Symmetry: C3
Subunit: 314 residues, 3 copies
């Protein structure tokens, strides 16, 4: 049975806009925990993380808020490892995507053999040196990849980081706004990716087959799904900081997560970048939160074909 | 040549909301009959059915308005059988989906070998015992299936019903909100279905190929298409009683119906659950009615590639 | 390297509505030339064409503004041939689609072996005799096809036209509103087409593979892409004169143009039928222009997976 440990991560300093901190709150108030319980799920809530203010946090070169971002991820890694040791699937409610450094790092402490599926409009693989924005939510993958050690400078706040995945252990789905440095890294390291071009070419059906065969073909292993809500088209998730048109549909989002659930190997989940304050209308917030909840429920067994308990309904 | 008998079925008591009775009216005022004539069609209008008021209709256990629903379907079955005996394709304008009991039953009197394609967000296969709503528009398939006789109680109003299809004679397309009891029946009886998950997996092209091969592979036979407008996404058909997000697109809807037309075997058609009173704006009503008309026109030969008469246009 | 010659064609008299003349202006003000320069491109601007007023232009039978349309295309053919002789890809900003007579004709003077890809909701293949509207933007293909000479009357303004393509040298993508005479011609001449039905059936991936294999399988040759913005769904390009629902998505539009870019054979491009005055809101205009610019940028190398210069980014 599929058993979850919920971790709230109200953190925003990996990017400029403030409202992403309210991510955990609006998802919970949408009745996420209750809805999980209403399906097959054993849910334990490990609460929202207290991220202390680090008021003295001047840029490292162009990299903004490095100490705050680093500490938040350090804290999150500790909590994720704790929930994993308790035999539960970690469900991190973000919060900006810089937290993926902490989420994946903590997960990997307990399950070093994890494979990562990254659903996003962006690769989030800028280094502190290639970034032109300095926003750390556009950099987390570079901190995790072994191949890029010695390319990442000693950024204050990140001394605790030990890269825990290789180029072969991650697959991107949804990419349509990739920086030139990022594209260079992508091609250089030979990372498997399905940009929107590939999804258009192959269909999401083949994308998922290829994705799961790629990661699980050799050996079954724990899956970490890091889901940036901006992976989906802004017509479905508008209340987010860096929306890009031409995204994955609602249907494609549910297909990805249904197929992932059915492997029985989902081990860690990030639901990131929901910013209710960026909704142009109340309905836009509602639509974004509703979609994020739907995505989450699919990850833990809710199937569009229907679900039933193991009894005779007739 | 493709020859039609139109039957209006202004009936609503299979569900709570009243405006679905206006279905026939708004479709006709959209110029449906004229547009059919403007393509290849021989159209006879058998008028709107007069459904008498049965004011004494207390629930049967939780099942609501059983006598009214039963009589409406009994009447409709008689009219459908009449149009079929006249060598015409019955076109039923609904009205709520409980009327499918009458439509399919009457059709099957004349053509017992029919196969059913059911386009819907829902399976509509609750029994009077499994339903939690009591709304009969969520139950019609259970009354039609031979396998489920002895599971259906003697509901007042339905003594005339004799189940006329087996589990193998129906294919669902579009399913994304299926009750647990319904999912149990679906899996137990081995009914062929393409939920939105399958449509996402395979593409509507393969779905239609599989659907038609399934029903027609052994032997050519009459097709009954029961089309709930909520099968399509609410972005296309919002003025309907039980909308569910993540539906079939407009394009997928036309593809389904184009492919069905081209078999030359369409024998019965239901266009159900249009409720103009549920449109949030006049445009939403217009959009819903326009889409329903477009779907209908495709069923009778209107092709997106173009149509032409058998002459030399040059 | 991919090298462009921009030609503004502010012309509207191939159809009734006036604002399409502002096409070049709003695309340029959207920063199109700058954005092309911001990617790999050598851009020369050959300016906007001065189309003299021909006030004496009474209908030829039902065909409207024949002399004005004919002269505009004659002028455009001269400019396109000039840019082609200069070793550049002609980029024509329309303007209504009647200008395709001039664009393709001029291109073909320099590269007689061109193949045409026509992205549109319409076939634009009515002759002056089959048209029921008389609008010349619905007729340009008939003037270009060799097979139809002797079917085209001596329309004033078009004596300069010499048909330059055969039935085999054109592929349509996007068709969903085709007149009966047009469908007759399509089927009679055996022209390759992918209506929305085929796109639904096969997926845009297979459509592009088949399209390019069809045109380029035997021999590599220059490609002319004539892109009517109404090929895309009106949810993406609403500010256009003849919108039709159920169109190609934004994603499909970018996939078509990405795949075309990657052949290295794009030789001529038309971006047609943008009419800012038909936007119901400022945002609709913006959305239409934004989409058209995005389509154009994809034709000249902008890839959703990312782009990078030939250096070491690390
Ligand atoms: N690549 C960006 C966006 C990162 C998004 C983070 B994610 O996916 O968690 O939301 C954007 C860089 N871009 C450079 C030029 C254009 C504007 C900013 C960056 O800041 O590095
Ligand atoms: N399955 C439902 C909806 C039926 C829709 C009828 B159709 O497709 O003609 O429109 C809904 C049951 N559901 C149970 C719990 C949630 C709310 C109601 C039911 O009432 O049985
Ligand atoms: N086929 C039409 C539309 C042409 C669109 C031109 B394009 O693709 O550049 O935008 C429409 C003919 N139709 C006949 C009956 C219905 C209304 C007009 C025509 O005018 O010939
Ligand atoms: Mn992102
Ligand atoms: Mn991200
Ligand atoms: Mn339904
Ligand atoms: Mn139904
Ligand atoms: Mn057009
Ligand atoms: Mn056109």
């Amino acid at each position: 049975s599929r058993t979850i440990g919920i971790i709230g991560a109200p953190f925003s300093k990996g990017q400029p806009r403030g409202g992403v901190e309210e991510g955990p709150t609006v998802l919970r108030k949408a009745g996420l925990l209750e809805k999980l319980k209403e399906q097959e799920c054993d849910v334990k809530d490990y609460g929202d993380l207290p991220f202390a203010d680090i008021p003295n946090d001047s840029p490292f070169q162009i990299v903004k808020n490095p100490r705050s971002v680093g500490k938040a991820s350090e804290q999150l890694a500790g909590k994720v490892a704790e929930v994993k040791k308790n035999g539960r699937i970690s469900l991190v409610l973000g919060g900006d995507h810089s937290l993926a450094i902490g989420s994946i790092s903590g997960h990997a402490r307990v399950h070093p053999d994890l494979g990562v599926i990254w659903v996003d409009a962006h690769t989030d693989i800028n280094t502190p040196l290639t970034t032109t924005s300095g926003n750390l939510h556009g950099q987390p993958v570079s901190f995790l990849l072994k191949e890029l050690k010695g390319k990442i400078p000693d950024v204050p706040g990140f001394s605790w980081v030990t890269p825990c995945i290789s180029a072969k252990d991650i697959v991107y789905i949804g990419l349509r706004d990739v920086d030139p440095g990022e594209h260079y890294i992508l091609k250089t390291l030979g990372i498997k990716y399905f940009s929107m071009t590939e999804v258009d070419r192959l269909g999401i059906g083949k994308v998922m087959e290829e994705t799961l065969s790629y990661l699980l073909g050799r050996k079954k292993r724990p899956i970490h799904l890091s889901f940036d809500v901006d992976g989906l088209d802004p017509s479905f998730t508008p209340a987010t900081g860096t929306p890009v048109v031409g995204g994955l549909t609602y249907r494609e989002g549910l297909y990805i997560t249904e197929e992932i659930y059915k492997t029985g190997l989902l081990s860690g989940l990030d639901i990131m970048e929901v910013n209710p304050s960026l909704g142009k209308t109340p309905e836009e917030v509602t639509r974004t939160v509703n979609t994020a909840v739907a995505i989450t429920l699919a990850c833990f067994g809710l199937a569009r074909e229907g679900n039933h308990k193991p009894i005779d309904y007739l």
